[PDB]
């Protein structure tokens, strides 16, 4: 059943599973034409497909071709979704394909069965978590190949970088998932805690900077003030 | 007009046949059905006054056989059987029909709901879905699970409905997922009509012999496989002009003869609010929309 507050932990148990999240599949510039109407602008998107456990990113880049003469996009989006998803799996060996996928919009329900009707035996979930997963196009690196691809294109990264080495997979992902929701409240104060010190940098293999222990602790208090600011300059309080 | 006489009726129940039904009181002197229309399949079905749970009935077709009913004090119901003897029958009927000690088909001459009902449903193919070849009548109550049902346990007291399920391999062709999905035309027209059920008759058969048992028994499998078959068609963007107009008018016989009190259980919000306002053939339908709407204008 759906993924919760109450079942967190299983995220970080040995069954492999993976994150799907859609929103970024199909994105758009909204603008006027000469004769002053609106119309849209199809850009770059991606999958974020994501093992919560490892860190394993499945970055699909969504070619604006792909939507070419296309009809219904924000459908059709979600089942080009599932059909990359579905060929994932069928292209990962059999030891490595999730027992478990978990959609982060219950939308993406239907479309992902549908697609993985050959494996029965992968669980489709839907989440009540509301993570922020949406915010992985605010992640320089990941935006930057998105935009630059002229082709479709698959690219694969860790989103924890070397984290793993000094702490567990649940404290890994609560930090990634602070920096995402402090990137979505409030992307340029977000950046700017993560870059006011250029002495510390960010490795070429790696997505974000190379704080120590010590760091984070200063950095991660940075994005909860952030966040808690935001939600009063938001709400008046 | 063939006649199914009864040896007595030693409990007092309410007897069906098909969409007409009376009381019948504890040892009261009732010994049959006569009239009942040649054409056309028919139940009978009983309620008992103890117990009214348990809808239970005999879809039959005098054509067939000679039929009679008789209760069974150990098993605790009308049963009815098949008489040989066609001599031993006439002699058994006429003495009942002499004595007036039998009810009448009440058809009214005007009424065509019962042909309208059961217009595509055979005999031969009842005895398809519910299994039992020894007897040439087909018993089905409101407890019997279906095939379906089952996969998701008895499987000799089953109702073998066509399993519809539209997140399945049948339904859906590798590289049309989408397409298959959105329109359901290759799941209705390939797969079902011309693969399993041959022709839109024995569909439309099965669909309304689906309905009645609901409707008769509060058969809940059943139900959910009308709601299959009629939501199978609707969500198709192709099929044959005829198969649309003729489904206008089953369905709405349908919903004209459903007890008004009863649609809360036996009719699908979901799927009836899909069929006539959301599906490809929403516009396909205007005699059931009509009806509905008149009707049943909460369910929408
Ligand atoms: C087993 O002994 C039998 O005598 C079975 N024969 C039988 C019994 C009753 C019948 O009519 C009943 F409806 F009134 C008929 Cl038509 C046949």
Same mark, same amino acid.
Do not use: A, S, T
């Given at each position: 059943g759906a993924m919760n507050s109450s079942n967190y932990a299983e995220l970080f148990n040995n069954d492999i599973k993976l994150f799907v999240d859609d929103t970024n599949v199909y994105r758009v510039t909204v603008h006027k034409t000469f004769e002053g109407n609106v119309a849209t602008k199809a850009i770059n998107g991606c999958i974020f497909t994501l093992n919560p456990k490892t860190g394993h990113l499945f970055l699909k880049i969504i070619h604006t071709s792909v939507w070419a003469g296309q009809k219904r996009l924000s459908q059709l989006a979600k089942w080009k979704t599932a059909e990359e998803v579905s060929a994932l799996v069928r292209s990962l060996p059999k030891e490595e394909q999730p027992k478990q996928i978990i959609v982060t919009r219950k939308a993406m329900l239907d479309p992902l069965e549908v697609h993985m009707l050959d494996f029965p035996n992968i669980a489709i979930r839907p989440t009540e978590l509301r993570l922020p997963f949406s915010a992985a196009m605010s992640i320089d690196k990941l935006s930057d190949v998105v935009m630059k691809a002229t082709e479709p294109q698959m690219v694969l990264f860790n989103? +924890? #970088? #070397?984290?793993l080495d000094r702490i567990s997979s649940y404290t890994a992902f609560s930090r990634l998932t602070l920096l995402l929701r402090a990137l979505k409240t409030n992307e340029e104060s977000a950046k700017m805690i993560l870059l006011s010190d250029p002495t510390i940098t960010i490795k070429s +293999?790696?997505?974000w900077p190379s704080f120590t222990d010590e760091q984070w602790i200063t950095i991660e208090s940075q994005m909860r003030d952030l966040i808690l600011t935001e939600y009063g300059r938001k709400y008046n309080v | 007009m063939n006649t199914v006489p009864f040896t007595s009726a030693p409990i007092e129940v309410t007897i069906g046949i098909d969409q007409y039904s009376f009381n019948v009181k504890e040892n009261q002197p009732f010994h049959g059905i006569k009239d009942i229309p040649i054409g056309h399949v028919h139940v009978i079905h009983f309620q008992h006054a103890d117990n009214s749970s348990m809808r239970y009935g005999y879809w039959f077709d005098c054509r067939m056989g000679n039929f009679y009913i008789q209760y069974d004090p150990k098993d605790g119901l009308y049963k009815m059987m098949e008489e040989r003897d066609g001599a031993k029958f006439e002699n058994i009927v006429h003495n009942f029909k002499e004595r007036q000690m039998m009810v009448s088909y009440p058809k009214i001459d005007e009424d065509d709901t019962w042909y309208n009902l059961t217009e595509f449903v055979q005999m031969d193919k009842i005895r398809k879905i519910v299994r039992k070849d020894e007897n040439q009548f087909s018993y089905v109550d409101s407890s019997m699970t279906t095939v379906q049902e089952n996969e998701l346990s008895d499987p000799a007291h089953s109702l073998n409905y066509t399993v519809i399920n539209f997140k399945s391999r049948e339904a859906i062709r590798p590289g049309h997922e989408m397409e298959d999905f959105l329109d359901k035309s290759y799941y209705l027209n390939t797969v079902m009509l011309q693969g399993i059920f041959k022709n839109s008759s024995n569909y439309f058969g099965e669909l309304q012999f689906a309905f009645l048992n609901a409707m008769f028994f509060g058969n809940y499998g059943s139900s959910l496989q009308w709601h299959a078959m009629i939501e199978l068609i609707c969500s198709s963007a192709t099929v044959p002009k005829h198969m649309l107009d003729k489904l206008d008018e089953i369905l709405y016989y349908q919903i004209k003869t459903?007890?008004?009190?009863?649609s809360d259980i036996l009719l699908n919000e979901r799927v009836w609010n899909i069929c006539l306002y959301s599906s490809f053939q929403k516009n396909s339908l205007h005699n059931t929309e009509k009806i509905m709407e008149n009707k049943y204008p909460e369910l929408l």
């Open positions: 989103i +924890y #970088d #070397d984290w +293999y790696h997505l | 459903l007890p008004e009190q009863y």
